[PDB]
Structure formats: C-alpha cells, structure tokens
Amino acid sequence: MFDESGEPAYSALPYGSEIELDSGEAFAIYVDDGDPCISPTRELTIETATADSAGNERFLLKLTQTTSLGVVTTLETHTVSLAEEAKDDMGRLCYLPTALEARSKY
C-alpha cells in the first residue's frame, strides 16, 4: 500500500479475501499470479517520466526478479499515470488499474 506522501506499507491477505483500502492510503499494488515470492524475490521500482502532452503527470513502474544468489533480471516495465484521463506515448490509456489489467500478467 502507498501513502499520500508515497511511502510503502507491506502486508498479506488470504486468497479468498478482498482488498479494503484504509483511509489515508491512496492505492495498493498486489500480485495477481498465485506466486509466493519466498525463494525468487520480486522487487518494485518507481521513477518519474516526462509529463503528458495535456499536462498530466506520468511515472515509470518497473518489476524485477532476484534469485537467492544475487542475479537480477528484468520482468516488466510500464508507464502509468494517476490521472483518470491520461494517454501513453503510443496512445493507450495510462490509468493504473486499467493498464495493469490490460497489459500486465503479474
């Protein structure tokens, strides 16, 4: 879960249960695939990107996989915008839930 400032909070939930966002939290990102990250560690990286043509703000979301030994590999990258009406460099939508549902399998 992500605070308004942007700090992360970690937790876990049973598979049957549904996510409920506490007040004071903006958004949460979880793993759809039924894959525990115990032996292969999955890391999430956030960095800023150029603003949209219409003045909207967008950032880069990246996912990486690290083994126990220390070998780091890259899984996925996306451009995501918090604004409801935002567009990608290719013209696709950048709204976080819609983009994650469309072009992400993790």
Binding site: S53, D88, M90, G91
Partner: protein
C-alpha cells in the same frame, strides 16, 4: 506535418450533400407543334426558279 502520438492528420476536404424533396416538375408537349410548324418552312426557303413560266 501535424503528428500527435503515432497518428498523422493528412487533409481536410469539403463535401456537398443533397437531400431530396417530393416535389416534381415536368415540361409540356405543346411547344413541339409550334417547333415543327416553324421547322417545316425551311424546306421551301432557299429555293429559286431561274426562268419564269
């Protein structure tokens, strides 16, 4: 070149639309008789007789 994201805007044209109405208009066959009567006269014109008798 007007290029936004990955699409080009090439040209803008203008069109003329036609939407009909039920009304109709037609000519009459009355003037054809006068036309034929006038046309018949050109047969006798441009005819001469050299020697009188």
């Amino acid at each position: 070149m007007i290029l936004n994201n990955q699409e080009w805007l090439l040209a803008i044209f203008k069109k003329k639309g036609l939407t009909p109405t039920g009304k109709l208009e037609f000519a009459t066959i009355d003037g054809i008789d006068s036309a034929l009567a006038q046309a018949l006269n050109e047969a006798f014109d441009s005819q001469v007789v050299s020697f009188n008798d």
